[PDB]
Design a protein around this ligand. Structure first.
Ligand SMILES: Nc1ncnc2c1ncn2[C@@H]1O[C@H](COP(=O)(O)OP(=O)(O)OP(=O)(O)OP(=O)(O)OC[C@H]2O[C@@H](n3cnc4c(N)ncnc43)[C@H](O)[C@@H]2O)[C@@H](O)[C@H]1O
Ligand SMILES: [Mn+2]
Ligand SMILES: [Mn+2]
Length: 269
């Protein structure tokens, strides 16, 4: 069976309980995770150990908090007390875990299921070939010995409009923002980097990225996490918003793909 779970955010107990609910069995089952495995919840260390141990039974994409953790580890960015990352950063296997984490994809595609996953979704300004090329380029910098320099370069809110002519720092910044920070778009597809509200509370003319028809979403289903204020609701057919805010006191959501059946684990707070 195929299971898809939204943002775990260090909620190790809830993750394990939800996987026991569906009797997840590596080797017979595969798990997709929308990223943001770490921060906020108490168990980032155990979450990373377990997900890494799953090997080929898990298909992960990296989220914005996974990237922030990598930036802290590399000495690029400052640790925030509220993220509760110190046990993981001080663990004897931190190097092993974070070197594995930075090698994980930004984008997962399954052609037999016609299914695409990224942390924040697929910007309507991208077709599938471009999304794949951009994911490959950022994965290449993150997998390289020089990844601290990329992590430093990635910070920024511009440019917010895609063009195949983008080069260098602006290209990498847009790719990073589209995959891991996107929520709202302007009518022309341009990213808005500020509003994190639910679609009903957002200012005009902002619309959710998935409300703008795009070539990937016309052919593929898209699963994503990231957007907690969306609460997993309000999406069109073929769009699966899996982040129901477990770390925030919401729920951890798991979707079984074969029958589109949902399983929910309440947050423990
Ligand atoms: O800049 P981003 O990187 O896009 O977002 P973030 O605030 O830094 O964190 P995260 O990626 O985990 O997103 P989240 O929705 O959880 O966090 C974004 C904001 O959404 C808020 N939020 C979480 N759940 C919400 C809900 N159910 N309803 C309304 N707002 C909610 C949180 O206070 C948080 O500040
Ligand atoms: Mn996120
Ligand atoms: Mn998140």
């Amino acid at each position: 069976a195929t299971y898809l779970i939204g943002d775990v955010h260090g909620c190790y107990d809830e993750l394990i309980a939800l996987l026991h609910k569906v009797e997840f069995t590596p080797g017979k089952d595969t798990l997709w995770l929308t990223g943001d495995l770490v921060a906020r919840g108490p168990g980032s260390l155990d979450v990373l150990r377990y997900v890494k141990s799953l090997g080929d039974s898990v298909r992960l994409v990296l989220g914005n908090h996974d990237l922030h953790l990598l930036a802290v580890f590399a000495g690029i960015s400052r640790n925030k007390p509220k993220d509760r990352l110190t046990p993981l950063l001080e663990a004897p296997d931190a190097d092993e875990l974070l070197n594995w984490l930075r090698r994980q994809p930004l984008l997962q595609i399954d052609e037999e299921k016609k299914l695409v996953m990224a942390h924040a979704g697929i910007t309507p300004q991208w077709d599938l070939q471009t999304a794949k090329e951009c994911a490959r380029d950022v994965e290449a910098v993150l997998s390289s010995d020089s990844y601290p320099f990329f992590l430093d370069a990635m910070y920024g809110d511009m440019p917010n409009n895609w063009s195949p002519e983008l080069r260098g720092l602006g290209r990498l910044r847009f790719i990073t923002n589209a995959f891991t920070r996107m929520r709202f778009c302007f009518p022309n597809g341009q990213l808005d980097m500020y509003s994190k509200e639910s679609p009903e509370e957002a200012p005009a003319p902002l619309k959710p990225w998935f409300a703008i028809p795009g070539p990937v979403a016309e052919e593929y289903s898209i699963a994503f996490g990231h957007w907690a204020s969306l609460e997993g609701k309000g999406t069109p057919e073929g769009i699966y918003a899996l982040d129901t805010g477990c770390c925030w006191g919401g729920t951890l959501t798991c979707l079984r793909w074969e029958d589109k059946q949902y399983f929910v684990q309440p947050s423990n707070r």
